[PDB]
Structure formats: structure tokens, C-alpha cells
Amino acid sequence: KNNWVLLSTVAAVVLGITTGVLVREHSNLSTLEKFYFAFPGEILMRMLKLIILPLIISSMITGVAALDSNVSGKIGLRAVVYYFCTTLIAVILGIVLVVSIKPGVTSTVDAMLDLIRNMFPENLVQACFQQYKTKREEEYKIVGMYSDGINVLGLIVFCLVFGLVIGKMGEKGQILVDFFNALSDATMKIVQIIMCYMPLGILFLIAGKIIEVEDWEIFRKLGLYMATVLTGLAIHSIVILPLIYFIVVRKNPFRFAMGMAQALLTALMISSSSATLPVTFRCAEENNQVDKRITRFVLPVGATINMDGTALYEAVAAVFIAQLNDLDLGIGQIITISITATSASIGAAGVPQAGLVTMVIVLSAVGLPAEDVTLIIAVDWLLDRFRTMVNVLGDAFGTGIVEKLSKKELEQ
Ligand SMILES: CC(C)CCC[C@@H](C)[C@H]1CC[C@H]2[C@@H]3CC=C4C[C@@H](O)CC[C@]4(C)[C@H]3CC[C@]12C
Ligand SMILES: CC(C)CCC[C@@H](C)[C@H]1CC[C@H]2[C@@H]3CC=C4C[C@@H](O)CC[C@]4(C)[C@H]3CC[C@]12C
Numbered sequence: 001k002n003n004w005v006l007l008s009t010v011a012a013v014v015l016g017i018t019t020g021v022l023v024r025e026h027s028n029l030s031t032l033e034k035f036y037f038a039f040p041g042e043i044l045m046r047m048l049k050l051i052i053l054p055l056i057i058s059s060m061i062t063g064v065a066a067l068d069s070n071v072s073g074k075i076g077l078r079a080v081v082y083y084f085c086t087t088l089i090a091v092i093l094g095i096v097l098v099v100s101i102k103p104g105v106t107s108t109v110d111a112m113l114d115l116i117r118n119m120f121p122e123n124l125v126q127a128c129f130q131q132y133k134t135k136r137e138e139e140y141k142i143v144g145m146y147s148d149g150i151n152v153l154g155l156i157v158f159c160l161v162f163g164l165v166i167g168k169m170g171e172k173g174q175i176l177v178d179f180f181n182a183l184s185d186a187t188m189k190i191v192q193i194i195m196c197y198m199p200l201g202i203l204f205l206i207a208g209k210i211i212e213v214e215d216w217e218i219f220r221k222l223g224l225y226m227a228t229v230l231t232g233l234a235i236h237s238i239v240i241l242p243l244i245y246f247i248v249v250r251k252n253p254f255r256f257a258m259g260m261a262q263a264l265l266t267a268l269m270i271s272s273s274s275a276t277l278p279v280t281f282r283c284a285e286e287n288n289q290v291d292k293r294i295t296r297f298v299l300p301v302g303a304t305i306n307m308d309g310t311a312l313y314e315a316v317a318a319v320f321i322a323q324l325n326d327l328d329l330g331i332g333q334i335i336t337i338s339i340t341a342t343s344a345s346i347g348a349a350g351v352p353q354a355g356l357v358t359m360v361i362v363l364s365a366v367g368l369p370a371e372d373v374t375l376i377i378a379v380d381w382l383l384d385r386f387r388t389m390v391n392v393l394g395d396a397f398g399t400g401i402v403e404k405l406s407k408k409e410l411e412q
């Protein structure tokens, strides 16, 4: 019905819980038998991990090269600055809520430097399956290591520089742009094939998790995770973003949101910001009367670099999974998670189920068990819909900001 992706995921979740409760109470499997029961779920995890490397590399180069076209002049610069500030506040807001609420609960300088080191790997081939970690030994020295763990930060940064370089090379770099455009297109087709197998893998992933839960405390922790994500998205969409619009534009932001209601409603159903653009353009220019020039240079940019939703959904999810693993975490470790979350999303911007694919990238890069994402998919459909609604609203408000900040340019 063109919504099989949503129906299949919910059906898999519902049947996964039904299978888990029945098997747990009507059977007593051993440790080895329980592992085999989740094997279809394990195979799904390998497919998602397998497609990470071509997805992020092809998409980041494709997106960055395409972004070079949209981001031109001062008008484009206003949107880039606007999306940096709103994303920055979302990153801080997400960390404050997950650290204070503490959903799944019960050196900082080294982590920060390791973050910069990973952004500049010493070998691109090794960056696909290894990450750099440092330690303090004893008067105290520093010892690097290099351990298994795809270096998403290094690959994304290089693709950023690579994408910008080829985009500016004109015709000499067109073959590289065409090559990675087709590779990106092919990878999305491959993920669609994996998405067809997802309902079977999700069924056994969730079902196996129900067999292994000793106490219902995990369900309570999942509820706090939903509250943390919903609370952060609500505050950003209701308080922070309208406040930013109000001060810069000195107009009522709530009226501005009414014109986008058609786009906001479409954002939930489709659950993709890029696919909602045609509706977003119509609402922004017709209902909000925003100049058509701004919407052309702002909305395409916002569909790529608007990470407010990721900073409030995927970053919070990664820290929540870390807290589930009894990791004490720190300022340096949380900042590493937050940057990884935004880097993963930009590399998986148009992938079906960005939320699932992005989280698997974040967990793999950070080091948390990629199988702990099972709890995320149980409500990912619900939270991903709200995440996209905030992203579209952020871009819609961004168009009003750039118009007010670039009135003189429009006159000229
Ligand atoms: C240190 C962290 C923030 C990453 C480093 C980011 C900065 C230093 C990097 C990221 C992408 C890079 C750009 C990539 C492509 C080009 C095109 C080239 O014709 C001139 C240099 C220029 C414009 C680079 C300048 C340096 C740059 C802006
Ligand atoms: C993903 C990790 C490494 C964080 C990097 C995030 C930020 C710093 C990166 C991600 C993609 C980048 C953009 C890629 C392409 C362009 C087009 C260019 O004409 C102006 C800069 C601009 C708009 C870049 C600004 C910096 C940017 C927004």
C-alpha cells in the first residue's frame, strides 16, 4: 500500500513480542539454543553492517558535491550558520536531558584528542575497520593502540574534503561525481533489498531479547528513553526554534507553523525530509509568503545539514544504550557520541529507515553492541516520525530567518 515499510516494521515488532512471551513461558531453552533462535536477527545485523562502508562513502561525497551547488553566495552562508546554531543547541539539549534524566541507568582531554585523531586517520583502508585509541601510562606518557571499530569520523571527514575538491574541479572531476552518484544510487537499491528482509530479522531480534530479559526494569528504562527523546524534540520544536524565529524575525512563530501544517503532516507519513520538500516548498512560499529565491538555496541545504533531529534522537539513543551497558561515560565520551551521531546521519541521509541504519553506524563506531539497537526499532517508527517533523519545522523556520537576514540581497 506504499506504506509496507511502516506496516511491516510494526507487524514484526508486534509478532516479535508475541513470539518472545510465548517461547519464554512455554519453553525453557538453553544458552546455545537461545543463540540459534536469534540467528535470523544476527544475519540482519551483518547486512546492515556490511552496507555501512559503501553507503557513507558514496553518500557523503555525493551529498557534499551536491551541497557545493546549493550553498553559494551570502544567502547560502546564512543557512549554513543557522543550521550550525540550531544543531548546536539541539546537541546540548539532548545531552542535558539524557545526563539528567539518566534513562537507562541502574580522561576528557584524551577523549577529545582521540576525537581529532580519528578525524584524520593515518590510513584510509584501515579507517574502514579500525579506530585510534590512546591511554595514559607510567611522569606519564601517551600510548596509541588502533583497535577494531569502523572509523566513521575519519571516513566522513575525508569524504567531506574529497567531495568539496571534486565538486570544484568542474569537468575534470565530473567522472568522479558521476561514479559516486551511481555508487550512491546502487547502494540505496541494495539497502531496499535488505529492508525487505528486515521484518524477519527484526522479528527474531526483538523475540530473542524478550527471552533474555530477567526483569521488567528494561521496559521501564525504555519508557524513560521515549520520554527523553520526546521531551527534547518537544522543547526544540515548541520553545527553542520558535524563540530563535521570534527574535530574528520579530513575528509570531506560531502562525508561521500553521502554514507548514500540510508539510508537517506529510513529514510524519513519509518520514523523510528530502521527500517532503515538494510539499515544503509549496507551504513555505504560498502560506508563509517566503521568497521563492530563499527556499531554493535554503531548503535543499536544510534537507542535508539539519541535524537537530539527530542530535535529539540518535545522539540520545546512543548515550541511552551506553548507560544500559553500565558505562559511566564522561564529557569527552558523550561529545564523541554526539559528533558520531551527526556524522552517521549525513552519511546515511536518504537511506530507507535512516534511524535504524544511522544507529547501527553510531553503535559500531562508538563501540557499543550493535545488537542493543533492538530496543530502538521497537519505537523507532514512532520517534523517527516525530524526528522528521522537527527537522521540517527547523528548515521551515530557517527559510524565514534567511529571508529577514538577506532582505537587501533580494532587493539587489
Ligand atoms: C579540523 C576539522 C574541523 C576538519 C578540518 C576542516 C577544514 C580545515 C577543511 C574541511 C574541508 C576542507 C576544504 C575541502 C576542499 C577545498 C577545495 C580546495 O580547492 C581549496 C581548499 C578547500 C576549501 C578545503 C579547505 C580546508 C577545509 C575547509
Ligand atoms: C560530519 C562531521 C565530520 C562534522 C562535520 C559537520 C560540518 C562541519 C560539515 C558537514 C558537511 C559540510 C558542508 C559540505 C559542503 C559545503 C558547501 C560549501 O560550498 C560551503 C561549506 C559547506 C556547507 C560545508 C560546511 C561544513 C559542513 C556542514
Ligand SMILES: Cc1ccccc1Nc1c(-c2ccco2)nc2c(Br)cccn12
Residues within 6 Å of the ligand: 080, 081, 083, 084, 085, 087, 088, 091, 304, 305, 307, 338, 339, 342, 343, 346
Ligand atoms: C551546519 C554546520 C556548519 C558548520 C559546522 C557544523 C554544522 N552542523 C553540525 C553537524 C553536522 C552537519 C552534518 C553532519 O554533522 N554536527 C554538529 C554538532 Br555535533 C554540533 C554543532 C553543529 N553541527
